[PDB]
Amino acid sequence: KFEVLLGVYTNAIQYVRFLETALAVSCVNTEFKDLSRMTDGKIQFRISVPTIAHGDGRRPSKQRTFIVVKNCHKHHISTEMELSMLDLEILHSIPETPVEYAEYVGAVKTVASALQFGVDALERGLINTVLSVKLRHAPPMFILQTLADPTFTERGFSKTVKSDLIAMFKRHLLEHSFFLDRAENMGSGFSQYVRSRLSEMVAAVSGESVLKGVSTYTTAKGGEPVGGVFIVTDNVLRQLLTFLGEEADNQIMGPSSYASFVVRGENLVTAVSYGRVMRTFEHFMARIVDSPEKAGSTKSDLPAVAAGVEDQPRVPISAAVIKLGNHAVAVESLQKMYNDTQSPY
Amino acid sequence: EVHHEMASIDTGLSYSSTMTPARVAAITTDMGIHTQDFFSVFPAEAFGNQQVNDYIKAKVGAQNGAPGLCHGQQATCEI
Amino acid sequence: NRGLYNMVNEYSQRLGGHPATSNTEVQFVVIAGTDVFLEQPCSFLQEAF
Amino acid sequence: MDLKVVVSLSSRLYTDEIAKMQQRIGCILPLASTHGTQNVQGLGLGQVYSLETVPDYVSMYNYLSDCTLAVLDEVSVDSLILTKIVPGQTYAIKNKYQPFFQWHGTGSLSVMPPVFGREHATVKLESNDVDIVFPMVLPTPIAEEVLQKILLFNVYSRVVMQAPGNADMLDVHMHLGSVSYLGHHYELALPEVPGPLGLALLDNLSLYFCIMVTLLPRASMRLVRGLIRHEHHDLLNLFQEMVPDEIARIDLDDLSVADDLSRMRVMMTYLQSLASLFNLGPRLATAAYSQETLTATCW
Amino acid sequence: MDLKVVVSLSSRLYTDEIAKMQQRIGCILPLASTHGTQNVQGLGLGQVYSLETVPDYVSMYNYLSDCTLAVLDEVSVDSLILTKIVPGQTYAIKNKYQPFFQWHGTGSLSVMPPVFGREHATVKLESNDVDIVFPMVLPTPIAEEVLQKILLFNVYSRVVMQAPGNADMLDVHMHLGSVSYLGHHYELALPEVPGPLGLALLDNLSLYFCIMVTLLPRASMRLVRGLIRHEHHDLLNLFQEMVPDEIARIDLDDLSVADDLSRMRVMMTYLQSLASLFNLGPRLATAAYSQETLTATCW
Amino acid sequence: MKVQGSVDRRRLQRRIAGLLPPPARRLNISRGSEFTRDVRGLVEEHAQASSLSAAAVWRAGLLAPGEVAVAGGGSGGGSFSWSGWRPPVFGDFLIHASSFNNAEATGTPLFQFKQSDPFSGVDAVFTPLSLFILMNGGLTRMANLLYDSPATLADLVPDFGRLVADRRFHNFITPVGPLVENIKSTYLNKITTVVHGPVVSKAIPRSTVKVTVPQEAFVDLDAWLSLQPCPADARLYVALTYEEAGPRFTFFQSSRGHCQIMNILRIYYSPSIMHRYAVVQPLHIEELTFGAVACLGTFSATDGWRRSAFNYRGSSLPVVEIDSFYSNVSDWEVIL
């Protein structure tokens, strides 16, 4: 008569890489080897705005230029692992007899997995940091909708304009919130209503971004450059799959590595002597002294505005997408990392 | 300790993301009539006569935990 | 009082002044929040329903 | 082994405050949690010391003796880099304080809440609406002297609460709130009403005192009476030709060496207990110092 | 790290002095400068204890708490090699001390200034015209016993020097000659007939303790009556009965408040200094001891 | 032209290349490799154990110049510390066969009581259980089950009744620390304990020792007392209290700092002093002293206390066990 150890199973941790998530559609990933040195970053836009001549005696507005400055923000990420000193001790000594060898291999396996956990925790940290940064600059919908409309700000922000905008805000708050809740009573207009709501969400966000012309993530099907990313929980993703029915493509095409930034060259001298390092010192020297006369052209600027984003080869990212209006938009669920780490979504 | 650093820049100039509520899943505050205790808010304040103060404290119900909560998180009420 | 764009940025970016705690028997104030994700729409509008 | 803490600020601070903090490089300050990533709230001595609140110094000593101590290493627009002080290390440390006192290199330093001033010691950060307070370090003798000043002022502000006139509290303010160092006087900011933890400490002092007062040896009293009656010493400068009335009443019993000896034994057994209580703060021993560098090798 | 110090000499040694430094080879010395090669004038207590001066006990204790200890390694013609003490490293020590005391394992060793005559602690070197003084090591219990007994001996000798009708020197020498500890007895020789001026190494510690015990009764009652509060520590009310009735009957009012505060202040300074003095700060553990080798593995 | 007086040229560089290197920290990680000789060299803890051979010992490097075992021969020795690592100091006591019960928890704290006989050769030891029995849940039950015939204990202490009346019994005890090894002999037991350093057992198959104290005796000082910070080190204290029924023995654990520890011990003993010093007993010179407090060392905070059964002869005791202890004894401080 005996008792039987009839099964031994161990869970396996799947690697989660930032580039494989659909969320990475909404970012530009630069590999900058020594980030700790950069004290502060800076981006300066210069925009020229024209006016239209008028026959009235009206006083005219002169030539208009605006100078916009944006700055980097840094993030620190850290995790703690614990190792039993006995394991780190027996790892050095050679094995004497096969039981010592069995204990040695068990020890090195344990410590290796203890480090696997660490690298995995840091990757989940990267992805959570990007998601939180995106959440910090995402104003709510009922404020965005009437502000995207240029019809209500045509004459600028006086008193009465704002007194009416607050009314539109409170009204959209009372009416259009929890739309996927209202779909049940809305009934047969369910699909068209959800489509119009998602399309209002899409059109509300401004699309004027400097890197718009660069060849970012594309549809797996030829053409149709992907426009953006939805992030939803699993239940709402199921409801969206039901109402939208068929999905568009089921996979997309994205880059395989991050664009490297190297401080080599005379940027090294400008970093030794001075605090500043100039980006794209090749083109920036060429524009001033090498080719001072010629005026810039967008086609001549496009190879410059992508430092290393362009050269990379593309591979199929697995992510669910749809097509709405004229835009291919991926819909992505992350509520599998936050469940497994057992942190709130 | 495993460390990492990151750097972020907003690319464009306007708002580039929109969050919005889609579906209510639960209502937590019980939407009750629990009134906030001013006596526990101000433990210094008191009337003149000591026994009058103590009798008012006895009749008003002034002062824990609650053993079991049928609805959920109680929401204070103010008058 | 400030411009409404600065207020819109502050809405989603920085949390509201002294909101209620969550998953507690009663409603305390939350002075330092750990994984607290609430936001309130009444603060900027200054109304109640 | 590796001692390093980076403290991450949520929003970038302005130029004025980055300059004010870069003046502050090389500062001792307590943080609460021993991790590589620390929030801006747990930093500094601020969260216990408030602008609106009455200053209580013993509670700040209490908070500081428990919070881990670190040295300011680097100031940035978003991140503060501070090295941690482990109990078992040697640290090259820098002295630049505004209320500066000279350093021997012989005696251990001590850390204390900012008794001298609040404004010149604080740094406000309105970018992140938080206030940082740098505690003050001193050589041990002046530290113990200031502590004695503060406690005696607590007791005498309490007692003269029921006293006749202003001149008496004015005499109390002289040579209690003021620390007189070579070439200057320095004004300690003192509470008008000390109510928390002043009791909890002075009461233990009173317990020790009332226990010790029973078992005094009489031979010392007789000796002091004889010496103040005949000779004059700088330690005997206090008693004039007058001799106090308590001693004249306690002395009268004869001398037995056995009882005085046992009393001396017990009094020593209590003095060593009394010595432990006066510290209430971290003590950093110093081995070497350079006046041209204002740099010690503390331990 | 490598910690060995070498003291060279101006001139060559005599044979007698070579034997005399072979005598106390495995013992403890204060070393003024931590540097590797050093002169002779900084390895002893001659700066602290001299024939020409009159020594002061608080001074010697201050120097003992602020110096780096060391153990000899090798005595050679024209050179000496010691091993430096660093906190947190193990050493082996011998007991070569002219007043002998038994050592017991797992005890507490204490480095207190050598209170006895020169001939028990000093070692004379005429080739360079110096005298090296060795700090006496002692098991901590006996270290406190001898301290208190010689202090009370000085108290009573000075008392009977003032007024003869107070004591009998026979009783003093009977109750304060011997020290019994751990089943051994050690009879210590008191320094007879202390001179009128403070020519004894003691008598300053004695004045400090005497000022303290004379100022304690005025201070303790004022502190207790000041600490009376609507709320206070509960044991205080029960321990207010401990004070003798004679001390209770004192009217707290004195010649002035300022004098009372100055008395409190100086008394408290003396109390803290003395409380630090009785701890016998430089202290060492002991792991094992062998009597035929006379060796203790300490740290 | 080349005089070459000093020997520093072409020679001192080799010496400083050995005296040069510090131990490594902050090793950078590549994802794809995920494991290298670099990470292993950062990881290896470099133990100290004998293989009982010439070549094997010299490879293990036990014949190390510094206090720590360093391998590689010439390559080693340049660590210059291991975060201030100090090898444990050991203490070896000789015990009668009846005083210390042969079955013990191997991490129990010990105490040596000084005797009076001159030039002695044996010295006494006690554990908290024998210490209980000497002073006269089911701590009483199991303490009786382990130790019978208190006379065999009382003979080592002929002054117990006198010292507990003169309040001097506390100074005679010196705390030693946790156990390490017990060598059982018919007539004289050989006890090996550890002082002033890590508590790690000597068994050649490496095993962990956690210091255990009976849960009856242990008193969590921080619990019943009440944003607040948290330090890494929490100290462990013993308290010997002369109570009316007799002397009693308790433990405490806290990180509040010395002054706060004193104050919380004051209010923790307040009712007992209120009862004892009261009408029941008046004052006298030698009776004033009440309690003694001594520190036993530091333990990693936030771990806490595992609660374990200690089983002897089919009877259990609830015992708090503390991992990763660091033994460090302190003097006795008088409390009243």
From Swiss-Prot, chain B:
It is found in: Virion; Host nucleus. It comes from the Viruses. Belongs to the herpesviridae major capsid protein family. Homomultimer. Makes the hexons and eleven out of twelve pentons. Interacts with triplex proteins 1/TRX1 and 2/TRX2; adjacent capsomers are linked together in groups of three by triplexes, heterotrimeric complexes composed of one molecule of TRX1 and two molecules of TRX2. Interacts with scaffold protein; this interaction allows efficient MCP transport to the host nucleus. Interacts with capsid vertex component 2/CVC2. Interacts with the small capsomere-interacting protein/SCP. Self-assembles to form an icosahedral capsid with a T=16 symmetry, about 200 nm in diameter, and consisting of 150 hexons and 12 pentons (total of 162 capsomers). Hexons form the edges and faces of the capsid and are each composed of six MCP molecules. In contrast, one penton is found at each of the 12 vertices. Eleven of the pentons are MCP pentamers, while the last vertex is occupied by the portal complex. This is Major capsid protein. The chain holds residues 1087 to 1184 of 1381 of the full protein.
UniProtKB/Swiss-Prot annotation, chains D, E:
InterPro entries: Herpes_capsid_2. One of its GO terms (cellular component) is host cell nucleus. One of its GO terms (molecular function) is structural molecule activity. Keywords: Capsid protein, Host nucleus, Virion. It comes from the Viruses. It is found in: Virion; Host nucleus. It holds the Pfam family Herpes_V23. Coiled coil: none annotated. Interacts with TRX1 and major capisd protein/MCP. Belongs to the herpesviridae TRX2 protein family. Structural component of the T=16 icosahedral capsid. The capsid is composed of pentamers and hexamers of major capsid protein/MCP, which are linked together by heterotrimers called triplexes. These triplexes are formed by a single molecule of triplex protein 1/TRX1 and two copies of triplex protein 2/TRX2. Additionally, TRX1 is required for efficient transport of TRX2 to the nucleus, which is the site of capsid assembly. This is Triplex capsid protein 2. It comes from Epstein-Barr virus (strain B95-8).
From Swiss-Prot, chain F:
Pfam families: Herpes_VP19C. GO terms for molecular function: DNA binding. Its main location: virion. Keywords: Capsid protein, Host nucleus, Virion. The keyword Flavoprotein does not apply. GO terms for cellular component: host cell nucleus; viral capsid. It is found in: Virion; Host nucleus. It comes from the Viruses. InterPro entries: Herpes_1. Belongs to the herpesviridae TRX1 protein family. Structural component of the T=16 icosahedral capsid. The capsid is composed of pentamers and hexamers of major capsid protein/MCP, which are linked together by heterotrimers called triplexes. These triplexes are formed by a single molecule of triplex protein 1/TRX1 and two copies of triplex protein 2/TRX2. Additionally, TRX1 is required for efficient transport of TRX2 to the nucleus, which is the site of capsid assembly. Interacts with TRX2, MCP and capsid vertex component 2/CVC2. This is Triplex capsid protein 1. The gene is TRX1.
